[PDB]
Structure formats: structure tokens, C-alpha cells
């Protein structure tokens, strides 16, 4: 097998067609299914895989109680083929309360973070063996993408942050070759706070649309040069902003360089990608909570910060149903690179008190150049009826 280079053009996208749904919470009501959060999708050259961070427990289990916490010693990265739910035959690939995975065209890299909040370790596991590790540099929850990393010519890049995620003080881009850290670039450019990046190959580079937990309801962009390791950063220009919380569409605004300072604090992992001057992006339908999910194109929304001209809206999850994180993944086709996304469908605590557990399902959509209709594909479990 060769290394991936992703050097094909991006596919024509008219919108997204349904690709996969796991129905994990519905299946957990009558079968042994892992409690999870922070899912993502990544593909080898043949098959797509679903990933999630386990809570070291199945859902119909005494250990499923108090699964709200994001960091515990029992969290592991679960890996299955996409559409195989997380049943007891699922491989735990590493110890992790934060992760990123990608296939370089020869093998899987997993970036696996665990240990103390003040003193976490990232393990780099490549082709089934631990090749490298790094300690927390600013001693305040070392954390990574919770979605796929991107590899070009056998160099994989992952965005990692520590501290309160301030710019150069806290965020680094690691360049990794067969699991070995070969280079580390500090975050440069005007993105002030950068977490949970959703990254895609954009040959020759990698582009990441990220979360700002402090200042922006507009999303940071990080552009990563794979050859000379140089970093630039800015914000998604679009006046229709991708973060939650945010202002409503009539009152929201954005900046191409700076955080917009509108409902800037907190965030959700999400994604966007350029289509010339236009942007395709997903977001929650509700501005103030993780309810519903929609995608659309904003015309000139990659270049023009005054633009609010959306077209090609699709409801993925209707506004009455819970969403969660979402991220991009890229799939190599015959002549072009397609863009796909997943939506985490979070169920249970703290927002739903019918149950003691917190878990997710997924729904997955892929870019289409063809035509498509309408629907809503929510989680679909009835928490009134199933194991507490």
C-alpha cells in the first residue's frame, strides 16, 4: 500500500445524502451496548470506521450511573466498522479520555490522551504499537480533536491544546511519521482560542475548523502547511456563525480575523469547509442549546463577513431532537475528495433525567453531487421505557 496524498480535487457538492446511522441507544434497551460520547468517523482506503470514547461500561449496567464526566481512568477509544454498533466484541484500541485517529494509507495512527488533569500523557499508537508519547506541556487537561487527524505523504497532523487554549501559550500542531513525533509547531495567526478541531485534507495542506470556548461564536480556522510545518489561523468569515451558543441569524455578525465577541463563551465541536468563496457548514438549529442539526451553503461565506445569503439548507435532526458534537471526515472517490460529516446524538444526563446514564448514537451524511430530499434522522430511543 502507498501513503495517502489526497491530491484529487474536492467533489462538487449540492448537499449531503444519508450514509449511516447506528441506532445505539435503541439497541442498548435490549442488548449489551457500550456507553460512549465524542464519536467520530474515519476511513481506511477501503472501509469507514466509527470511533468513540467508551465509559468502561455498557448502558444496561450499574457502572453506567454518573457517566456525565468526560475524564476517568476507564475511558478507552472504541473502534468498529461504521454501522456495527458498540457491542461487547468491540476493540478498545487504547486508554483515552480524548483522542484522534487517522489512517495514513498504510496503517492506523491513534492519538490517545489519559491520566491526571494536571499531568496527562498523549500516547501515539501506530500499526498496533506505542511509538511515542508526550506529557501535558501547560499542566491543564491536554486535549485533542475528538475527530479524524489527516495524513499527507505519511506525515499525520493533529491539533492539541493544553491550559485554557490561549493561542501560542497552549495550542500546538504535531507532525507525526509512522507514530513518531517529528515536529511541533506552535499555533500562529489571529485565532485566539482553538479546541476540538475538525480537519480535512486540502492538498497540499490541511485545513481545520475549530471551537472557540471564550470569545468567538464564529469558528476559528487553522491552516497547516505539511511541508514547512508553518501555521496560519483566522475565523470563518460567514455572518451566519457555526458555534453554539451564538446570536440569531438577524443579529449575528462575524470577522475574518477576530472572534466576534457575540455569545463567545462555551461552544460545540462542529465543522465547515470552503467551496471557492462559499462555505458549507453544519450547526445546531437552536442558537442556545444542542437541539436539532442543519447544514447549508452560505454564498461568499468563506470570504465576506457581511454575507447571510444561505442556500441548500437540509435538516439532519429536527429542532425538537438532541444533537451534540459533529465533525468532518473525508473520503477518497474515483476522481475527487468527498466531504462527509457525523452528528453525535447525545441522550440522558444532565438534560434528560428519565435515566442515570449519558450516551450517544450517531448519524452520518456524505456530500452528493446528485439530488436529495428531506427527512429527520434523530436518535429515536424512548428514555421513558428503557433501562434507568
Amino acid at each position: 500500500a502507498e501513503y495517502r496524498n489526497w491530491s484529487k480535487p474536492q467533489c462538487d457538492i449540492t448537499g449531503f445524502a444519508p450514509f449511516s446511522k447506528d441506532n445505539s441507544i435503541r439497541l442498548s434497551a435490549g442488548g449489551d451496548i457500550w456507553v460512549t460520547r465524542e464519536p467520530y468517523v474515519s476511513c481506511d482506503p477501503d472501509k469507514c470506521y466509527q470511533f468513540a470514547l467508551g465509559q468502561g461500561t455498557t448502558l444496561n449496567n450499574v457502572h453506567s450511573n454518573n457517566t456525565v464526566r468526560d475524564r476517568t481512568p476507564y475511558r478507552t477509544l472504541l473502534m468498529n466498522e461504521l454501522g456495527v454498533p458498540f457491542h461487547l466484541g468491540t476493540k478498545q484500541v487504547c486508554i483515552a479520555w480524548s483522542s484522534s485517529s487517522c489512517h495514513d494509507g498504510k496503517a492506523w495512527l491513534h492519538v490517545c490522551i489519559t491520566g491526571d488533569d494536571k499531568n496527562a500523557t498523549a500516547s501515539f499508537i501506530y500499526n498496533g504499537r506505542l511509538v511515542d508519547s508526550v506529557v501535558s506541556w501547560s499542566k491543564e487537561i491536554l486535549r485533542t480533536q475528538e475527530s479524524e487527524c489527516v495524513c499527507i505523504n505519511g506525515t499525520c497532523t493533529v491539533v492539541m491544546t493544553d491550559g485554557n487554549a490561549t493561542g501560542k501559550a497552549d495550542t500546538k500542531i504535531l507532525f507525526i511519521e509512522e507514530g513518531k513525533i517529528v515536529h511541533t509547531s506552535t499555533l500562529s495567526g489571529s485565532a485566539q482560542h482553538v479546541e476540538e478541531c475538525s480537519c480535512y485534507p486540502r492538498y497540499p495542506g490541511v485545513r481545520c475548523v475549530c471551537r472557540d470556548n471564550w470569545k468567538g461564536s464564529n469558528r476559528p480556522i487553522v491552516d497547516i502547511n505539511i511541508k514547512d510545518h508553518s501555521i496560519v489561523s483566522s475565523y470563518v468569515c460567514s455572518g451566519l456563525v457555526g458555534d453554539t451558543p451564538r446570536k440569531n441569524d438577524s443579529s449575528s455578525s462575524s470577522h475574518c480575523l477576530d472572534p466576534n465577541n457575540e455569545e463567545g463563551g462555551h461552544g460545540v465541536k462542529g465543522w465547515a469547509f470552503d467551496d471557492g468563496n462559499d462555505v458549507w457548514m453544519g450547526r445546531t438549529i437552536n442558537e442556545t442549546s444542542r437541539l436539532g442539526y442543519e447544514t447549508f451553503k452560505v454564498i461568499e461565506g468563506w470570504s465576506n463577513p457581511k454575507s447571510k445569503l444561505q442556500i441548500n439548507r437540509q435538516v439532519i435532526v429536527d429542532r425538537g431532537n438532541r444533537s451534540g458534537y459533529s465533525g468532518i471526515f473525508s473520503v477518497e472517490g474515483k476522481s475527487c475528495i468527498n466531504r462527509c460529516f457525523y452528528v453525535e446524538l447525545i441522550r440522558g444526563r444532565k438534560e434528560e433525567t428519565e435515566v442515570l446514564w449519558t450516551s450517544n448514537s450517531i448519524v452520518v451524511f456524505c456530500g452528493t453531487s446528485g439530488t436529495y430530499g428531506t427527512g429527520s434522522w434523530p436518535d429515536g430511543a424512548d428514555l421513558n421505557l428503557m433501562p434507568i
Epitope: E38, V68, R69, D70, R71, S98, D116, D117, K118, E140, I141, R143, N213, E263, G265, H266, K269, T288, Y325, K350
Partner: antibody, heavy 127, light 108 residues
Framework: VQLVQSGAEVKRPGSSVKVSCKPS????????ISWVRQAPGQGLEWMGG????????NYAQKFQGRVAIIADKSTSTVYMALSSLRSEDSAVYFC?????????????????????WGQGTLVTVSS | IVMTQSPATLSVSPGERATLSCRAS??????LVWYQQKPGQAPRLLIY???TRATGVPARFSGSGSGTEFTLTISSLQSEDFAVYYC??????????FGQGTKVEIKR
């Protein structure tokens, strides 16, 4: 759990001040210890807090850089240091224990409200 | 988030119902505590969520509201109850702003 603070202080502008807080019971739990001040005849103001077990602290932007919260299991004490004082910083400083005991990367803090307070520490500042 | 509190002082007779108001600048959901401060002391928690009394708080202290407007009602003020009262939001993300406070003072 009672909370107990260090005695009152009086300082020149541009100097630094140390306030400390101890429990009556065993050495500090996972519940956040936080620092709130009351400016003279005026409203309360949160300025920061620490998870005593994990030692991670966070601060209001108004105090960022010039304040530090430090925890030590051995002296069983949380210490709040404030630097480059001025007339504005003349206030009463309260130690307080939050119901909150964990910070979630994604979701933030649950129950960040104060169940127990120290007796207060006056800090006086004049040229 | 900004917390606005009214009235800035409330006058009430002994053995009479008090009502205090707090308003947020955004939805704080049900995450709104009420504290009582006597002037010689640190604050005491009365209410959390927006309605549950803290341990040992007398049943005459009663809280209600959600989203953006909240109230503390005291059923019949004793000499124990004339104090300053503060709302604070405990929304999931910093900073944790307080209301400027309502003084509750005796009518004669």
C-alpha cells in the same frame, strides 16, 4: 465543614498581598475553593477558584495575571495571592466552597454556587 | 451575563410578606442561587436550582422562576430576616456574576 481565613491586611499601591483559607475537618476535598470579594459598600464579585485535588485554577478576566490561587494538601491550605494593588483592590476577600467538584472540558462546571464561606479578610489600600 | 436585581432597597413591616426580584441578561435556565448577607458576616446560601431551600433554611423562605426572571418570597419576616439578599447565576461557564443586591429593611 467550617472555613477559616488569615487576618486583615494593609498595603501600599504596587505591592502584593497573601490571603489563605483552611477547613476545620480533614485536608481539602474535590469541591472547588473559590475567592469572591466585596468592594466597600458594593456588590459581590467572583475572581477565581481551584479544584484542590487536581490543583487547576481559573480566574475572572478582571484579575487575570495579577491573581493566583494555590493549593497544598500538606498545610491543608488554599492561598490567594494578589499583586500590583491599588485603591480599587481595597475590599473584603472571602474564601468559599462550591457544590461544584469537577470541570468538564466540553460542558464546564455544574453547581458553581457557594455552600460555605470563610469569615472574610479585609485588605486596606491607600497611597 | 449581567444580573439585575430589584428593588435596590425593599421596606417591609415585621410579620409581613417580602418579595425580591432578580433578572438575568440571558437564559440561565434554572441555575440561580439566592444568598442572605447580614452586614457583619459572610453570605449564607438560601436557594439553589431556583426553588430548593438549602439545609436548615426555614420553610418561610420560598424561591421561584426560570429562564430570565426569578424571585425570592419570604412568607412573614421575623427580626432574623432583615438582611441584604444577592442573586447569582451558576450557568455552566465563567464568569459567575452576582446581582448588585436588595437590602430588606424594617417598616415603622
Amino acid at each position: 465543614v467550617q472555613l477559616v481565613q488569615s487576618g486583615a491586611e494593609v498595603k501600599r499601591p504596587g505591592s502584593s498581598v497573601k490571603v489563605s483559607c483552611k477547613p476545620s475537618g480533614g485536608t481539602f476535598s474535590n469541591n472547588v475553593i473559590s475567592w469572591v470579594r466585596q468592594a466597600p459598600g458594593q456588590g459581590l464579585e467572583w475572581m477565581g477558584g481551584i479544584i484542590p485535588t487536581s490543583g487547576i485554577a481559573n480566574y475572572a478576566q478582571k484579575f487575570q495575571g495579577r491573581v493566583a490561587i494555590i493549593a497544598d494538601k500538606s498545610t491543608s491550605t488554599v492561598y490567594m495571592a494578589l499583586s500590583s494593588l491599588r485603591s480599587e483592590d481595597s475590599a473584603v476577600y472571602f474564601c468559599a466552597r462550591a457544590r461544584s467538584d469537577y470541570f468538564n472540558r466540553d460542558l464546564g462546571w455544574e453547581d458553581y454556587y457557594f455552600e460555605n464561606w470563610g469569615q472574610g479578610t479585609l485588605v486596606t489600600v491607600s497611597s | 451575563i449581567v444580573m439585575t436585581q430589584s428593588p435596590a432597597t425593599l421596606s417591609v413591616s415585621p410579620g409581613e410578606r417580602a418579595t425580591l426580584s432578580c433578572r438575568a441578561s440571558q437564559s440561565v435556565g434554572s441555575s440561580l442561587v439566592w444568598y442572605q448577607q447580614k452586614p457583619g458576616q459572610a453570605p449564607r446560601l438560601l436557594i439553589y436550582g431556583a426553588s430548593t431551600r438549602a439545609t436548615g433554611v426555614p420553610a418561610r423562605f420560598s424561591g421561584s422562576g426560570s429562564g430570565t426572571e426569578f424571585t425570592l418570597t419570604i412568607s412573614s419576616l421575623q427580626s432574623e430576616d432583615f438582611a441584604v439578599y444577592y442573586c447569582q447565576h451558576y450557568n455552566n461557564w465563567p464568569p459567575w456574576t452576582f446581582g448588585q443586591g436588595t437590602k430588606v429593611e424594617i417598616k415603622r
